[PDB]
Design a protein around this ligand. Structure first.
Ligand SMILES: CC(C)(COP(=O)(O)OP(=O)(O)OC[C@H]1O[C@@H](n2cnc3c(N)ncnc32)[C@H](O)[C@@H]1OP(=O)(O)O)[C@@H](O)C(=O)NCCC(=O)NCCS
Lengths: 847, 94
């Protein structure tokens, strides 16, 4: 329909009023903007002058009636927090919003037996009335017809789930910065949405008032500085740092030597003029890297000047230290897509759902008066439009995977424009893909650049145990990766200084024998360390300390380690070697940004230690290699060796599906239980690996050869145990099996003590395995090994957040949870006094 | 429950889990079930020198999760560090 948009008349004798009208408003009542012009007929060339007194207030009055629901009042401090009314997210608001911006993701549609999510662009819908209220104050004086939206950003808060239909969301906004630049005034606003008291996401809008502003008394700027690292090598570097009045440790006598320091500093600055600050502050914690790589607060930066030309704190850290960068670029960008989108014919539908009733997007006259090329598309529309493409093509239509999104508005888009977005995967950041984009119009002009932070797909890391190890493993990565270098070296230094061998030497060269020499002052210390290694058992409520290496006394000059084929295959060196290459791989991943913040993880046997060391940083590198060395030594003493260092123990992988389809895993458990009782030797099932395809039986190398022969016999004769034990006889099959076992036990006992094990039909012997891992043979080793773990897993390094529902122990294949129900489950497998005591006293611990 | 008491209980449970793991069978059937079915994992990355656990996952998928992967229309990648490093580091060949 046809409505009055501009009314021009004389108000007084010499004052022309051009009332501009907006007829698209919050409540339907049209809003007037009276522009006033003096008419001076003495000056014929230019008889009309604009009334410039309170002109920016008149414009703010109009926009306040369009945007803000409140009573008009521009006396509030920009420094103060702005609080927005609570917004309930309804299905109708999400439907209306998604159809406006063209977001066809299934996550935002109502489905049966499913809950409707709200898009994260819907954050501006909730936040607009708070965020925009920050450019209105008297002290942020600016022509609001000349207001550019420079950039907009969302950042999901870590842990926080995305917005759902039915959530009540509280906004608060605050001005981060407001600075006079030569070309006009910038205003950085930082919204924070909040559901049920916890904060959910952060909206960061920046606006730009074009003009000339000299009111520097009202400008200020908060900046979060990039984290800075300093390696303290010399007592010179300590002395320079103690010089600086702003460097303030909590304890003045703290030993900074060889420590790594991080400086997490915020700068606050007021201005006096264009380049001289009237006040600087640079405050923030100083943290020290511990051996677990966990940073802990040991002091503060606390610089505070008046009239300065610079922040000296930052300039110090820029030179002396090094910028820690969360974003790691990939080697080469990976193109994702190059997608077409269209801007809509009209800007009313977006204006209705967003609440952004800026007349420049809908009224021709206002857009003409503002010198714009026409009724320009909303910047926020183009944002939400492209965010819908990124979400479809980078996130594969899973809205929950978009955790960040920032777009710079470069240029103004007209309605019915064709836009071409290129989308690249350009980097990583804390296990989130870092996707750049650029949207160009028909004239191939850049209109909208930005970046998104897309979560990777649900990832689990698994860490291999023993059997895998091979000469030269991890060494390619050792030559290239700075993070692998730091792992291997830290461990190799700790072995050299303590046990007088290099773990690196053993992995590169795999020597058959290794002799440790106890000459000199250095070798006396090393020999003490090989005698200080003890089993702290508890027998009749009394500590009995036994010695590992009982053939190392006060009078020993050497000690020799002996293997048959190589010392990399000797558990006490395998375990540290194989834990280190895993920990170094993983540290290379973590340096390259590739480790999700909520990745699950699990280790097969030994891997558990590398997994806990990698993902949960429970032990340092030095504590870890100590623990697995001791663990490998605790296993080598329980097994009698000969002169070459070969035992009468090993492991067979058994495929029950290769022997016979009918022959189940309970048939294999039955046979092995029988062969362990008839012969009277040791054999159990230890690794349940792949269901009815790969079980692993550890035990007495003869008993293994009888099992291999029994199952090689049962295949060829084609005689099932499960059909015969039920449908034919009761315990006759037991006595019929005992003579099959005896046939194999008479052929295996005649062979010499260190018999080579042969590849059966349903049984393959594992290479480089001489210990019965995970058997009941090693039960006597638990008591001392447990007491050793308590000394070396410090309770202060057990972050529960990093294990809880993420780590799956081998013992109890259920995600780690600190609950009575979980402790009970752990007690029902391994009857331990300390676990029982925790279960029974659960209530006292609960409060 | 206070953080500092959760920390102490976690430390005790973690020490007891490692301690007994030494000399108790490895339930890797059940562990696979958890990370493959309960968490619907789409990237199993094996850290290690040989693809032995990546072997075991691929065989445990092909055996008892062929019909469940097709139904829920999910694509599992089973990547070993020592083979599939180009897929782990996002450095594909031009
Ligand atoms: C046993 C193991 C070597 C098999 O892995 P792999 O070398 O990839 O073997 P594959 O399944 O590809 O089979 C290779 C061949 O070996 C033989 N084989 C494999 N498993 C066998 C079994 N259980 N019984 C008999 N022969 C077997 C077959 O001849 C097979 O030929 P195919 O290709 O026709 O099937 C490996 O899974 C392993 O080392 N597992 C043990 C891990 C472990 O327990 N570590 C911790 C120790 S506490």
């Amino acid at each position: 329909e046809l409505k009055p948009t501009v009314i021009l008349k004389l108000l007084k004798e010499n004052i022309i009023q051009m009332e501009m009208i907006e007829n698209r408003t919050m409540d339907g009542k049209p809003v007037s903007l009276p522009l006033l012009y003096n008419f001076n007929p003495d000056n014929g060339f230019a008889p009309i002058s604009e009334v410039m007194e309170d002109r920016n207030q008149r414009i703010k009055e109009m926009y306040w009636k369009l945007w803000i629901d409140e009573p008009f009042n521009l006396d509030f401090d920009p420094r103060d927090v702005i609080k927005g009314k609570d917004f309930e997210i309804t299905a109708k608001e999400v439907y209306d919003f998604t159809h406006a911006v063209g977001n066809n993701c299934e996550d935002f549609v109502s489905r049966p037996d499913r809950t409707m999510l709200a898009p994260m662009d819907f954050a501006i819908v909730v936040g607009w009335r708070a965020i925009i209220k920050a450019i209105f104050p008297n002290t942020v004086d600016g022509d609001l017809l000349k207001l550019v939206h420079l950039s907009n950003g969302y950042k999901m808060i870590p842990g926080a789930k995305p917005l759902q239909v039915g959530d009540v969301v509280s906004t608060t906004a605050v001005i981060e910065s407001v600075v006079n630049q030569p070309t006009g005034k910038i205003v950085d606003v930082v919204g924070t949405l909040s559901r049920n008291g916890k904060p959910v996401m952060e909206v960061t809008s920046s606006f730009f008032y074009r003009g000339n502003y000299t009111d520097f008394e009202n400008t200020f700027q908060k900046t979060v500085e990039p984290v800075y690292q300093m390696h303290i090598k010399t007592s010179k570097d300590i002395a320079v740092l103690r010089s600086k009045e702003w460097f303030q440790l909590d304890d003045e006598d703290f030993d900074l030597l060889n420590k790594t320091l991080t400086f997490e500093t915020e700068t606050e600055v007021t201005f006096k003029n264009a380049n001289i600050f009237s006040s600087v502050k640079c405050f923030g914690p100083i943290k020290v890297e511990l051996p677990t790589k966990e940073t802990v607060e040991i002091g503060i930066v606390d610089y505070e000047a008046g009239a300065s030309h610079g922040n000296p704190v930052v300039d110090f850290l820029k030179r002396n230290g090094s910028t820690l960068e969360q974003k790691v670029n990939l080697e080469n960008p990976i193109p994702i897509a190059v997608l077409d989108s269209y801007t809509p014919s009209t800007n009313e539908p977006y204006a209705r759902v967003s609440g952004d009733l800026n007349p420049i997007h809908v009224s021709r006259h206002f857009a003409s008066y503002a010198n714009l090329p026409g009724t320009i598309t909303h910047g926020m529309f183009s944002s939400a439009s492209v965010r819908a493409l990124i979400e479809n093509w980078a996130a594969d239509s899973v809205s929950s995977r978009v955790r960040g999104y920032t777009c710079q508005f470069v240029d103004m888009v007209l309605p019915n424009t064709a836009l071409k977005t290129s989308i690249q995967h350009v980097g990583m950041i804390n296990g989130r893909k870092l996707i750049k984009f650029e949207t160009r119009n028909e004239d191939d002009v850049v209109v909208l650049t930005g970046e998104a932070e897309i979560e990777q797909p649900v990832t689990t890391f698994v860490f291999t145990g023993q059997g895998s190890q091979e000469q030269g493993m991890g060494m390619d990565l050792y030559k290239t990766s700075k993070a692998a270098q730091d792992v291997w070296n830290r461990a190799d230094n700790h072995f050299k200084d303590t046990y007088g061998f290099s773990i690196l030497d053993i992995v590169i060269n795999n020597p058959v024998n290794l002799t440790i020499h106890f000459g000199g002052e250095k070798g006396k210390r090393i020999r003490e360390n090989y005698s200080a290694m003890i089993f702290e058992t508890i027998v009749d409520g009394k500590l009995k300390t036994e010695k590992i290496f009982k053939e190392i006394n006060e009078h020993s000059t050497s000690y020799t380690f002996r293997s048959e084929k190589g010392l990399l295959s000797a558990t006490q060196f395998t375990q540290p070697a194989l834990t280190l290459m895993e920990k170094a791989a993983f540290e290379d991943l973590k340096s390259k940004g590739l480790i999700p913040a909520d990745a699950t993880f699990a280790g097969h046997s030994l891997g558990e230690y590398a997994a806990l060391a990698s993902l949960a940083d429970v032990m340092s590198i030095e504590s870890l290699v100590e623990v697995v060395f001791y663990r490998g030594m605790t296993m080598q003493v329980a097994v009698p060796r000969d002169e070459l260092g070969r035992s009468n123990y090993g492991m067979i992988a058994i495929n029950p599906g290769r022997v016979a389809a009918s022959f189940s895993q309970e048939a294999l458990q039955y046979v092995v239980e029988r062969v362990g009782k008839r012969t009277g030797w040791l054999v159990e099932i230890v690794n349940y690996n792949v269901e009815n395809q790969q079980y692993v039986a550890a035990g007495d190398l003869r008993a293994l050869d009888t099992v291999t022969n029994v199952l090689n016999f049962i295949k060829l004769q084609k005689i099932d145990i499960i059909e015969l034990q039920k449908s034919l006889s009761l315990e006759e099959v037991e006595g019929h099996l005992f003579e099959i076992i005896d046939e194999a036990s008479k052929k295996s006992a005649v062979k010499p003590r260190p018999l080579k094990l042969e590849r059966g039909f349903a049984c393959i012997p594992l290479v480089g395995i001489s210990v019965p891992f995970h058997s009941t043979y090693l039960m006597n080793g638990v008591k001392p090994f447990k007491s050793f773990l308590k000394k070396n897993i410090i309770k202060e390094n057990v972050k529960v957040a990093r294990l809880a529902g993420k780590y799956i122990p081998n013992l109890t294949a259920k995600p780690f949870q600190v609950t009575k129900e979980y402790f009970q489950d752990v007690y029902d497998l391994t009857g331990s006094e300390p676990i029982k005591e925790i279960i029974d006293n659960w209530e006292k611990y609960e409060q | 429950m206070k953080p500092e008491v959760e920390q102490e209980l976690a430390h005790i449970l973690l020490t007891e889990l490692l301690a007994y793991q030494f000399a108790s069978p490895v339930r890797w059937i059940e562990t696979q079930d958890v990370f493959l079915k309960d968490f619907n994992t789409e990237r199993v990355v094996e850290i290690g020198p040989s693809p032995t656990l990546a072997g075991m996952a691929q065989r445990t998928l092909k055996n008892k999760y062929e019909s469940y992967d097709a139904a829920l229309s999910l694509h599992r990648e089973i990547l070993c560090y020592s083979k599939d490093a180009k897929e782990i580091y996002y450095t594909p060949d031009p």
